[PDB]
Amino acid sequence: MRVGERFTHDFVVPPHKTVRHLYPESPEFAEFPEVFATGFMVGLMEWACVRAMAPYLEPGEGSLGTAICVTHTAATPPGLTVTVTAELRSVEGRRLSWRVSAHDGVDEIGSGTHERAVIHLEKFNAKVRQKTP
Amino acid sequence: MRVGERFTHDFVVPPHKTVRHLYPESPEFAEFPEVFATGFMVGLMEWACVRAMAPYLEPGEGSLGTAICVTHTAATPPGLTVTVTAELRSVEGRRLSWRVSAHDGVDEIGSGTHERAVIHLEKFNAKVRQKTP
Incomplete structure (x- = not known):
């Protein structure tokens, strides 16, 4: 895993x-225009970084x-391809940071950072069991 | 809309x-712990702000x-209640800026900012229909 790697x-x-x-x-979201949701874009950006860091994990880790x-x-x-590019920004012990950006083949659709532990x-x-009702 | 209202x-x-x-x-996500996804928390934060804004929009606006x-x-x-608190920071023309936070009854689970147009x-x-392939 190298800092600056995409x-x-x-x-x-x-x-x-x-x-x-x-x-x-959500009755608010029911009649919203048929566009890729920000929360799915987030999920896709995080998926890219999960795949990028899979080699860093030891047995028993996530x-x-x-x-x-x-x-x-x-x-x-729907129908366009979103490409997420994740560039590794820092890796120190348990903590990893990326710059992420996404484009749907027509426009840049968003960009910023994501951190993982x-x-x-x-x-x-x-x-998690101990706070489960 | 009033600035500072929660x-x-x-x-x-x-x-x-x-x-x-x-x-x-995603085969990677399929093996994750059964916890509320960040993409879903993002959508729940957006939903709180949509609800807050609704009485102030003219018909046919979103x-x-x-x-x-x-x-x-x-x-x-699953089974905990997530409460999102949203507080308006500013309104400038079509742009609304929010401070958001969420808590699950047990811990504060996240906070920061959100903007809407x-x-x-x-x-x-x-x-949108016109960039549909």
């Missing part, structure tokens, strides 16, 4: 990544996204 | 808002999220 991930946007599919519970700081600057209807999967799962 | 939005996390459900197509910049510092299993729904939908 990793790219391509995703054809299907009809079920539009706003209304993120929260079908990762969590601990911050997302991005713009979303143009809208994308390496976790011990079983210890983490025990913590 | 709006809250509560949401019981169901099983279908964990990481694996954000991208069922809005887009244009930036999100938040931490995500504690994990949330007011749109004319029909006009935006027609423009």
